[PDB]
Structure formats: C-alpha cells, structure tokens
Ligand binder design. Sequence first.
Ligand SMILES: *[C@@H]1O[C@H](CO)[C@@H](O[C@@H]2O[C@H](CO)[C@@H](O[C@@H]3O[C@H](CO[C@H]4O[C@H](CO)[C@@H](O)[C@H](O[C@H]5O[C@H](CO)[C@@H](O)[C@H](O)[C@@H]5O)[C@@H]4O)[C@@H](O)[C@H](O[C@H]4O[C@H](CO)[C@@H](O)[C@H](O)[C@@H]4O)[C@@H]3O)[C@H](O)[C@H]2NC(C)=O)[C@H](O)[C@H]1NC(C)=O
Ligand SMILES: *[C@@H]1O[C@H](CO)[C@@H](O[C@@H]2O[C@H](CO)[C@@H](O)[C@H](O)[C@H]2NC(C)=O)[C@H](O)[C@H]1NC(C)=O
Ligand SMILES: *[C@@H]1O[C@H](CO)[C@@H](O)[C@H](O)[C@H]1NC(C)=O
Length: 323
Amino acid sequence: HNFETLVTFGDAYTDNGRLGYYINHGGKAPRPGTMHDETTTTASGGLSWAQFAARDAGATLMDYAVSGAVCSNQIVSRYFDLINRTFPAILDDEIPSFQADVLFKSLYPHRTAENTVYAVWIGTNDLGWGAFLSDSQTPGKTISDFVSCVFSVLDHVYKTGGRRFVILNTVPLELAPLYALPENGGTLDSQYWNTKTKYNMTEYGQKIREYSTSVNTMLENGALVMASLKKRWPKAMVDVFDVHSLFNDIYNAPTKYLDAPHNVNSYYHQCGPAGSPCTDQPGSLNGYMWYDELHPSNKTSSIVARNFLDVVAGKSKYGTRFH
Ligand SMILES: *[C@@H]1O[C@H](CO)[C@@H](O[C@@H]2O[C@H](CO)[C@@H](O[C@@H]3O[C@H](CO[C@H]4O[C@H](CO)[C@@H](O)[C@H](O[C@H]5O[C@H](CO)[C@@H](O)[C@H](O)[C@@H]5O)[C@@H]4O)[C@@H](O)[C@H](O[C@H]4O[C@H](CO)[C@@H](O)[C@H](O)[C@@H]4O)[C@@H]3O)[C@H](O)[C@H]2NC(C)=O)[C@H](O)[C@H]1NC(C)=O
Ligand SMILES: *[C@@H]1O[C@H](CO)[C@@H](O[C@@H]2O[C@H](CO)[C@@H](O)[C@H](O)[C@H]2NC(C)=O)[C@H](O)[C@H]1NC(C)=O
Ligand SMILES: *[C@@H]1O[C@H](CO)[C@@H](O)[C@H](O)[C@H]1NC(C)=O
C-alpha cells in the first residue's frame, strides 16, 4: 500500500469513537492536538470500513467522522439531546478539528502530499428523514448544494497540503431496511423514523432513491469537471468510489459476499422505535448486510474496505480516477 496515513470525514458509517468523545465531554470536540479514544465496536457492530482499510494497509487512521453527521449544518442540521447541540457536521466541526490538528507534529509527525489519503463518506443523514427527505433543510437549499458542500470539504483539505482524495458516493438508501417497505424486510416505525408507517413509505423510498442516484451522478461529473477542466485542485488526484454499485452487487448476489444466512433485506440488531428493547438475530453477523436498519454490518464494511484499497491503487471496477 502506497500510503502511511488515512484521514477520514463522514458519519456513523465511518465513526470509530468521535461522537462518544462529544457525549463524554458535554458536546465539546477533542482539544486540538488530541484525538478521541478509538473503539473497535462501531455502528457496524465491529470495525468501520476505515479501520479495516487502515489495518490492511498498515496505515495510521485519523478518523474525524462523527455519528449523526451531515456535510454542513448551514445546509441542514439535527439536534442531539445528549450533547445539547446539533450533531457535528463536516464543514462546521470535523474540518476545523483537522485544520488545527495538522499543526501538531505529535499527531502528524510526517504528513506529505504523497503519503496521506483523505476520504469523505457523507450523505446518508443529509438525504434522509429529518433532513432533506422531510424538507427540513435551510429553506431554498437543494441536494445540488449538498454536492457543492462535498467539493468544499476537498477545498479545505487541499489548502492544508493534501492531494490524494477519495469521495465515497451514496449507498442505495431505498434498500436500507429503514427506507424499504415492510413487505421487502423494511422496518415498521423505527428508532430512526418513529412515524414511518404514518407516511407514504413507497413515495419516500422512491424519493430517497431519486436523491441518492442524482447526488451520485452530480458527484462523478462534478469531480471530473472540477479536477480535470477547472483545475480546482492543482496536482491533486480525485477518486470517486462507486459504493452504490458495490452495495447493489452485494444485495443482488449475497452468497458471493456474506456467510449464511446471506441476508440483505433484514438487519441483525432489531430494536423497538424507542431504541429499546433490542433482540439480535440468530447466526453470524457475517451473514447480514445490515447491522441495524440504517448501518451496514462489519462484514459489509470489510468489503467496502477491500474495494477502497483497490480504488486507491487505481485498479477497481468501482473507482474512477480524475486529475
Ligand atoms: C404512495 O406513493 C406511491 C409512489 O409514488 C404512489 O404510487 C404510484 O401511483 C401512481 C398513480 O398515481 C402509479 O402510476 C400508475 O401505475 C399504473 C401501473 O403501472 C406502473 O407499474 C407497472 C408494473 O410494474 C409498470 O410496468 C408501469 O410502467 C409502464 O407504464 C407506464 C405508464 O404510466 C410508463 O411510464 C412506463 O414507461 C411503462 O411503460 C408503471 O410503472 C399505471 O397503469 C397507471 O396509468 C395511468 O396513468 C398513466 C400515466 O403515467 C396513463 O398512461 C394511464 O392512462 C393511466 O391514467 C399509472 O402510471 C405508480 O405506478 C405508483 N408507483 C409506485 C412506485 O408504486 C401511491 O399512489 C401513493 N399513495 C398515496 C395514498 O399517496
Ligand atoms: C463482526 O463482528 C462480530 C461480532 O463481534 C464478529 O463475530 C463474532 O466473532 C467471534 C469470534 O469469531 C465469535 O465468537 C462470535 O460468536 C461472533 N459473533 C457474531 C455476532 O457473529 C465477526 O467476526 C465480525 N466480522 C468481521 C468481518 O470483522
Ligand atoms: C443547552 O444549550 C442552550 C443553548 O446554547 C443553553 O442556553 C442551555 O443553557 C443548555 N441547556 C442545558 C440543559 O444544558
């Protein structure tokens, strides 16, 4: 592997302990020059993709992702009672933490353009219930403004000297049990959407498919325009990792990717809409695409990580490379 350090921005799909730091510190971020304590039990039920990727590459992981995060709280935000403030966002919280940290040799002893890879995986929350899916954003903002936010994340990284960028696109959120119909293994009222069954679930599910696929088109063509034509990031490399297609591939051929029982339309950890009580399914978590109705399992996460390392090597059916 041709990198020593992996720096990640995102939400619970990536978070390896940083929301936990905020909860344990009254809603304060780690002091600059410090990182949160790492956990090996994430929203996946185990390691996140970033942990699998760093461990296989022999790289240091600097994981700024925060469970619950959106790209920009100026676009859309959600209040988190346990910290008495909004869930942290990438531009508002994660990037400012990273901008201060790179000044400390104790955290970044030898960060170069060549030896550090920067990845962003964001949009599951921005496009979902309580955000764009319920038209809860800042009035007038659109999903085009979310896509611009992702490129603004890369601008901030670029200005610190970063040059090797990976955008992970949005998953097929209509196949997450939170958004799927119950006839297809979807939740009834969920801990993440406790009034789901009062809405037209068919219409909301199709809407989130429209939003996710549209964001994915805009991220791929926007990355090519900005990188290759407008030279927005001179001497940078920008990969788009089509994790939407990888998730469709797992869903369509689970005997190729999962252990028994090769389950893609249900979820391992099944909680009532209060968030408790919860029962775990029988069998291995390695037999389930989804740990809960919104979060991919640690097995799915390990598949994302192996394909991510192929994208960074520039040899993936799921990677498109722009410079
Ligand atoms: C909750 O939310 C859901 C999702 O929005 C709502 O369900 C949608 O309702 C609309 C009606 O307003 C449905 O459209 C009708 O669909 C029927 C059946 O065909 C559809 O499904 C077929 C089976 O798979 C599919 O093959 C069809 O596709 C072909 O035909 C359409 C023609 O519309 C064409 O566009 C395609 O290219 C294909 O050739 C189609 O998807 C259909 O018979 C209806 O026809 C009437 O309307 C058309 C105008 O489009 C007109 O030509 C006809 O003369 C006639 O007037 C109409 O298309 C839609 O399928 C539902 N979508 C889903 C995903 O379920 C639901 O109503 C909401 N409920 C509430 C309470 O709000
Ligand atoms: C995902 O996490 C689960 C839960 O920790 C791992 O499975 C456990 O693995 C241990 C050791 O093999 C077993 O004793 C447990 O019975 C397993 N529990 C469950 C719930 O399956 C699993 O190995 C992890 N997978 C990956 C890819 O890391
Ligand atoms: C929560 O934050 C608000 C707004 O910043 C503040 O005024 C209030 O003191 C806080 N409330 C609690 C219960 O901590």
